[PDB]
Every structure is written in structure tokens, then in C-alpha cells.
Write a protein that binds this ligand. Structure first.
Ligand SMILES: *C[C@@]1(O)C[C@@H](C(=O)O)C[C@@H](O)[C@@H]1O
Ligand SMILES: *C[C@@]1(O)C[C@@H](C(=O)O)C[C@@H](O)[C@@H]1O
Lengths: 252, 252
């Protein structure tokens, strides 16, 4: 394991790190959420750009990123446009996705970016290189909102992300059975124990999958998402309750 | 599913039931522990009879059971002599083990007894029948303190307990790896999905297995052990922390 350290937070050792997502339409809503989040306890702030209205303007997007950065100057900040292709709130062209991510990277405003593996090989490789050249980490991600692939398929995907230079491979899948939750845990453990040389994040979604959000220290997921007031994906629980469980498991 | 209702507690529905073990070496210590346990919060009290150092006397054993019952008149009370063969504190003859269990049964002081599956089929059947004749439920049990059998063999054993008339089959196994914990969860789920005729209790022991003590609601373990002050098996955590996690998982 080589860890990923952002603003004194060490991802990939100790207790899994808590990520929460900020979701807002516009500058005023982003400010209101950032302010409300001061009362919560978490490790990493993800800005879910796909919840923002004016994603067409690179200037509008960067202004919002700047507001968030300045609101929370000492928090690791992760920039994520979750495409509708992968379960997000709106569509984007591959070219405009590239433009927004490059602009986020070279602005200095973010510590980490999410890059969807399935975007396309040339765009992924170029964006990984661009991120690294500007001292930004890449969470390379994949999501299946309908079903859970085989463990073999999931492990190969996480390995592919590593081979493409992801700092943190990430996969989220939807269980259709309790068995599918075990498949996700099995894949996570296999990856972490046998192939990974860096942190990985995994989750099985929905209430059925929630154990996967709690047991990362055991099965090898380095971070986990909680909800401040609204979940950013199915299965997230109240962030304080998430923290309570993580602490109990860490100290067991 | 044939649930087991004891003093208004429905075992096999809702949150896994919290069991704690009372371990006292003599009558005075049993009394002191029973009194102290009243303020802890749990669902079922197990008396670990093999920790009692006056098991030579049937009178002494029954007097200790009566002290516990008098301290906790409304708590489901489980009488367990854990044999040295299966990880307990002392060795007694098979006839001594059976006599203590029969005396516990016919005293009316306890609601449930633990009977080890591999005591011998004829003796197990006879003692189950005697329990049922006196309105006592049987937790039939098996323990592997060395390692984790195959999922398939664990399921076979739980099904054998069902065939012998157990009210609640129970198996505890020792992980040698994180993978082994998943094996135990897999066996548990296979009972829930395919062999769900009565409640089952399962656990993977030690620190690596702790998640199995927390995730019973997900995969189908009907009860889970916590520690009041000292653990009665490896991997048990503080009972209030156990309860906190069970509640979070139940309400997720
Ligand atoms: C990584 C990610 O897709 C995981 C979601 C989850 O399942 O918790 C939350 C999203 O906000 C996040 O981008
Ligand atoms: C059933 C049993 O053997 C399970 C142990 C455990 O692993 O928590 C605790 C024992 O006291 C109990 O009899």
C-alpha cells in the first residue's frame, strides 16, 4: 500500500475516511450548503457538480468551485461530475466533461478529481496525466446502478484503473440480493489483499448494501460516504452514525 | 420460520437479540455479577456454568441459577455448560453434563438450555425431548476454535441441529483470515435464503470476525453476544457499543 495524503488526511490507513457530498443548484445554494456543513464532522468534501444548474459555463463552474474552496480552505476537496451515464443527475458531452475537469485541475481549486473509467481510453489517459502534472489526485470511478457484476469482473475493473494511473480506484454497484453484497465484499477483499498497491473505495448501494459502507476497515475500502441531511446515493446513512460505527469497528 | 418467543422476546424477528454471559466462580460471585448485570442493557442472559467452580454439586448449581433468576425475574435465562471439548473452562463427564442440564430443565429456573450437537445423537435427542416436555427451549450448538469449516459443512451442521429438534441452531467458528469471515457470512445467508425453518445464531470469533457479530440483521443471525466487562469468547465487544451498532444497522 502506498497511501494518498491530502491536507494531512491519510487515505489508505487506519479508519476509513468519511466523504460527504455537497449538492446545490447555484452559488447561493452552494454557499448555504457549505455553511450548514460546518456543523457536520467528515474528512473529505465532494462537490457533486452534476447537481449544479449552470454546468455549461466553465466560468460558472469554476466560480462555484472557488466559493467551496474558500468556504472550506482546510478540507480535502474532491471535484465530481457524475454523469447521467453512471447514475448522476444530468448528461454531459465527453468533450465538455474533459473541459470542466481540466479547468478544475489547472485552477488549483481542488485536491482530487473523479474521472469515470468508461469515459474513453484517450480521454482518461490524458486527464490522468493532466491531473498528475498539476498535483491533483484521481479517484477513477465506475458505477452500476442496476446490478452487481461478478467478483472477477469487478476485480479486473479495479486493476484496470490502477494500471491507468488512478490514485484511488473506486467502484459502486447495486445489489439485487444479499448474495450480491457478499460478492462486492469478496471482490473488495481480493483486490485489496492481492492486487492493490494503493487505496481503493468500494460500495454496494441501497439499504441491502449498507454493511459495505460500514465494514471498509475489515474488507479493504479506504473511504465511505455519509449523508449530512440528503444522501448523494442510495444507502448512505447519517454521517454521525457512520462515524460511530467506524470508531467502534476501529477500536474493537 | 418458527420463531422462539421467551418472556415476550421474539427471537428470529427484528434486530438480533443481545446475549451477555455471566461468569462467576462461586455463589457469592454469581450473586454479585447478577446484581451488577441488572443495569446493563441486553435481551438474554446466558449463565456460563462451566466457569462455576462448584459444578460438583447439583445443589450448588441450582442455587446459583436461583440467585440469577431472583435478580432478573423477567429476563430470558439461558443455561450453558460449554464443554472443554468446545472451548469451555473445564471437563466433566457426559453423564454429569446431561444431569446438570436435566436438573436445569426440570427446575423451572431457566427458559433455555444450550446443548452441544456432537454430544451424541441419542443423548441429544433425549435431552431435547426432556427440555420440550418441560417448556424449555434448546439452543443447539457447535464450535470450531481452530479454524473455519467450509460454508457447506457449516450449513450441514445447522441443518443437522434442525433435524435433531433444536429450537435455535448455533455455530461459532474461528477465522484464520478475513476471507474466512466471509465464509461464515455466506453460510449464514444460505440458511436465511434456503433453510429458514427456525432462527439460527452464527458468529466468526476474534477481532477479524467482529463484523459477523454486528451484521446479523443483514445475513440472518438471530442473536449476538456482547461483553459486560470481560468477554466470554474472543471477539465480543462492549455490550453498549454492540447495541449502538445494531440499532444503526436496523434503522439504516
Ligand atoms: C463515488 C460516488 O459515485 C459514490 C456514491 C455512493 O454510492 O455513496 C456517492 C457519490 O456522490 C459519489 O460520487
Ligand atoms: C454460544 C457461545 O459459545 C458463543 C460465544 C461467542 O462466540 O460469543 C460466547 C459463549 O458464552 C456462548 O456459549
Amino acid at each position: 500500500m502506498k497511501t494518498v495524503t491530502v491536507k494531512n488526511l491519510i487515505i489508505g490507513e487506519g479508519m476509513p475516511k468519511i466523504i460527504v457530498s455537497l449538492m446545490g443548484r447555484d452559488i447561493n445554494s452552494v454557499k448555504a450548503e457549505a455553511l450548514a456543513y460546518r456543523e457536520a464532522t467528515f474528512d473529505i468534501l465532494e462537490w457533486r457538480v452534476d447537481h449544479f444548474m449552470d454546468i455549461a459555463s466553465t466560468q460558472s463552474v469554476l466560480t462555484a468551485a472557488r466559493v467551496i474552496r474558500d468556504a472550506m480552505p482546510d478540507i480535502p476537496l474532491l471535484f465530481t461530475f457524475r454523469s447521467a451515464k453512471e447514475g448522476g443527475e444530468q448528461t454531459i458531452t465527453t468533450q465538455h466533461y474533459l473541459t470542466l475537469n481540466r479547468a478544475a485541475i489547472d485552477s488549483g481549486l481542488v485536491d482530487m478529481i473523479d474521472l469515470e473509467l468508461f469515459t474513453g481510453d484517450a480521454d482518461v489517459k490524458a486527464t490522468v496525466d493532466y491531473a498528475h502534472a498539476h498535483n491533483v489526485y484521481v479517484v477513477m470511478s465506475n458505477h452500476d446502478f442496476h446490478q452487481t457484476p461478478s467478483a472477477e469482473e469487478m476485480v479486473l475493473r479495479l486493476r484496470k484503473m490502477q494500471a491507468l494511473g488512478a490514485d484511488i480506484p473506486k467502484i459502486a454497484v447495486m445489489p439485487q440480493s444479499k448474495h450480491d453484497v457478499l460478492t462486492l465484499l469478496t471482490a473488495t477483499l481480493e483486490m485489496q489483499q492481492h492486487y492493490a498497491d494503493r487505496p481503493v473505495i468500494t460500495m454496494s448501494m441501497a439499504k441491502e448494501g449498507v454493511i459495505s459502507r460500514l465494514a471498509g476497515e475489515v474488507f479493504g475500502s479506504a473511504a465511505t460516504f455519509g449523508a449530512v441531511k440528503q444522501a448523494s446515493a442510495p444507502g448512505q446513512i447519517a454521517v454521525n452514525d457512520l462515524r460511530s460505527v467506524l470508531m467502534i469497528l476501529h477500536n474493537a
